[PDB]
Amino acid sequence: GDRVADVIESSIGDSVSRALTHALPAPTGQNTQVSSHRLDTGKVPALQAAEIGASSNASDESMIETRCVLNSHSTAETTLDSFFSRAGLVGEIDLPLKGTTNPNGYANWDIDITGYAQMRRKVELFTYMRFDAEFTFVACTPTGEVVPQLLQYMFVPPGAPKPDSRESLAWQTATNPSVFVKLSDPPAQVSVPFMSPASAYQWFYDGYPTFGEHKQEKDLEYGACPNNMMGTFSVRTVGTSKSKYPLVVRIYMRMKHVRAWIPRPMRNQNYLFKANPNYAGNSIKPTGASRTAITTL
């Protein structure tokens, strides 16, 4: 039980975050109202104070004499699902015959979509994102040919044994989900849920994953958040003998049921690495085109 006044009148513990704004339905662009001339003192819509941090509240109606316009232009194509639910390339896997990389007929792809600029720049507009996804796998030879070859795709979550060869015991796949498909079949396609231990994935993590001294040799882990590491995607030609053809698997991702928080400035320098925002210091370019003078087009 409580008794001293400061404890009784305390606000310690208030879990309801007071919000200063609320969403309103807006299926179409705003209409324009008829306006006429105003010759007033005191009333001054055009004057603002950008220092405050808010955007101008001046509208067409108060800056010029407007007519009435019934605007029925839709706002549907700018919803997050409209913008993001379009499949784009996020990974590529090579299974060559006589090669440098994967000459063993199998390959492990680390599930990270930041290796491709188009997709990466789009998602990086937001800090946190939560979504389900549809992954499609397009396989063919390097010339775009289709051959009668059977493949096995397996999702290996963190902690499950990664196959180390085309004949690894891990392909028994008694618990991991696997897909068996021919190159001649249409592209394999599946639905993936939101799997992070966190409420959302985050494209930016300003911190370290562990405690301790953060010396030179460990600086590679700055910005690394395990909540974003969903595992490995493994692929192999299904057989005990080497395949007769070289293969390429392109991975497409289509987000769906998307939620996003905290928008940020959009990337304006070329990407160099997947794990970080490093940019080439000797090639810092302006965000856009330039001209010779401010008084000429």
């Binding site: 309103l24 004057l47 808010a54 509208s59 706002t75 549907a76 389900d132 769906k256 939620r259």
Partner: protein
């Protein structure tokens, strides 16, 4: 239907209208979203709101 509520948007402020044939709802289509917007959250997050007609600083 009588499926698992495991979609990423389960319990969201906006309601969706989707299609599905499996017991897990995250397998469903993207569907149509609800068209609500809240520009002020980003464009006008001031404590004491000022009018259009007024002088912002006084």
């Amino acid at each position: 239907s009588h499926e698992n509520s495991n979609s990423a948007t389960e319990g969201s402020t906006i309601n969706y209208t989707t299609i599905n044939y499996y017991k897990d709802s995250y397998a469903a289509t993207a569907g149509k979203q609800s068209l609500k917007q809240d520009p002020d959250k980003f464009a006008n997050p001031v404590k004491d709101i000022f009018t259009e007609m007024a002088a912002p600083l006084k």
